[PDB]
């Protein structure tokens, strides 16, 4: 009937709700391509369905909030793959060599006192 995964990337979450359907994807009450599309990276979110050839099987409804859009895409990528494994746990062995089910733990490195931006040091003269 329905399968779910959460997915997260860089202070951004996007809950993926999978239902068997024509292949049409809604994101925040907008068309998938009316939200994205002006962004070349957008197709990455959907790569889990091409790894299992789940293209024409599922419809998806997503709720994406937080962060910027490019991180929103990666969270959708995971949430899609998470709902995919809960659907058929035999897809773990399929999806895992690609890493689609791993979380990207890289977040903005905090700024540190004495530097300009958290690594970049102020330039000096000595003379």
């Amino acid at each position: 009937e329905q399968y779910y995964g959460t997915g997260r990337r860089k202070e951004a979450v996007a809950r993926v709700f999978l239902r068997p359907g024509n292949g049409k994807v809604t994101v925040n009450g907008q068309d998938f391509n009316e939200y994205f599309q002006g962004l070349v990276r957008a197709v990455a979110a959907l790569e889990p369905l091409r790894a299992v050839d789940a293209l024409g099987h599922f419809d998806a409804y997503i709720t994406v909030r937080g962060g910027g859009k490019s991180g929103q895409i990666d969270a959708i990528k995971l949430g899609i793959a998470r709902a995919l494994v809960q659907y058929n746990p035999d897809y773990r062995a399929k999806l895992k060599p690609l890493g689609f089910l791993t979380r990207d733990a890289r977040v903005v490195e905090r700024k540190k006192y004495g530097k300009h931006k958290a690594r970049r040091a102020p330039q000096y003269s000595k003379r």
Partner: protein
């Protein structure tokens, strides 16, 4: 890298051609962290090269990069006072970085107005064996075979 080998960064396959060399080229185009703009430059240049020439831009991009790969270059080495321009080979990883960076830095030296026009035109010339990028490659291998007299300093 004093300690380790400092392994290579593994680039993500191209979103379009599934090709890592594409992404690596797109990155050299990207400035100020705009990967979105850099792709739209590259892909809108793929339409120029495929219309103004009835040939697949995939094989031309490959063929252009190959013609700019230097087989040898010159390096300095501190010897007996002032140093020397010493010829030696180019590891195949460095042939990649140079030829890619050379294509991009050449295209921006071009006369054409819009970005993707310069890229596609430079690419088209580079595969054909001409254009500014192939001159940097043909000029480097001219440094070697010129200072060839120091081929015993190989290091």
């Amino acid at each position: 890298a004093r300690r380790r080998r400092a392994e290579v960064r593994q680039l993500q396959p191209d979103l379009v051609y599934g090709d890592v060399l594409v992404t690596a080229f797109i990155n050299k185009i990207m400035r100020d962290g705009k990967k979105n703009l850099a792709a739209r430059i590259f892909y809108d240049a793929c339409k120029i090269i495929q219309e103004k020439t009835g040939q697949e831009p995939l094989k031309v991009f490959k063929q252009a990069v190959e013609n700019v790969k230097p087989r040898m270059e010159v390096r300095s080495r501190r010897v007996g006072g002032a140093n020397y321009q010493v010829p030696m080979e180019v590891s195949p990883r460095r042939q990649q970085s140079l030829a890619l960076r050379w294509l991009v830095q050449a295209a921006n030296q071009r006369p054409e107005r819009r970005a993707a026009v310069r890229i596609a035109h430079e690419l088209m010339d580079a595969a054909e064996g001409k254009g500014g990028a192939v001159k940097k490659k043909e000029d480097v291998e001219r440094m070697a075979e010129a200072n060839r007299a120091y081929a015993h300093y190989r290091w």
